């Protein structure tokens, strides 16, 4: 077994330019479901809760944010302890 006949195929776009267009999320704020669809309040770079922006689960690309959020929220609401 020896290396013979190698192949290479890569694709990339050549767009050398920078401009404000995309927005980055900071963390989850609140959660609410409407029209059989669950949405989460996400904060975009520069944007504040004042704008009250909601994002669908499908678009939600940050599960960890919810995992931890539930931890804090749980304490807020009065429930029961279980192990």
């Amino acid at each position: 077994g020896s290396h013979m006949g190698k192949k290479t195929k890569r694709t990339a776009d050549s767009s050398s330019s920078e401009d404000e267009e995309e927005y980055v999320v900071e963390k989850v704020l609140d959660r609410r479901m409407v029209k059989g669809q669950v949405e989460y309040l996400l904060k975009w770079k520069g944007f504040s809760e004042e704008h009250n922006t909601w994002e669908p689960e499908k678009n939600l690309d940050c599960p960890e944010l919810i995992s931890e959020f539930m931890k804090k929220y749980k304490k807020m609401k009065e429930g029961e302890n279980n192990k």
């Binding site: 267009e21 995309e22 927005y23 975009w44 994002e55 499908k58 678009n59 690309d61 940050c62």
Partner: peptide, 18 residues
């Protein structure tokens, strides 16, 4: 430069007749 996962505001929405 961009490294962290980032996307634009809301994508994925068909515009049906009904």
């Amino acid at each position: 430069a961009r490294t962290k996962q980032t996307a634009r505001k809301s994508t994925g929405g068909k515009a049906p007749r009904y």
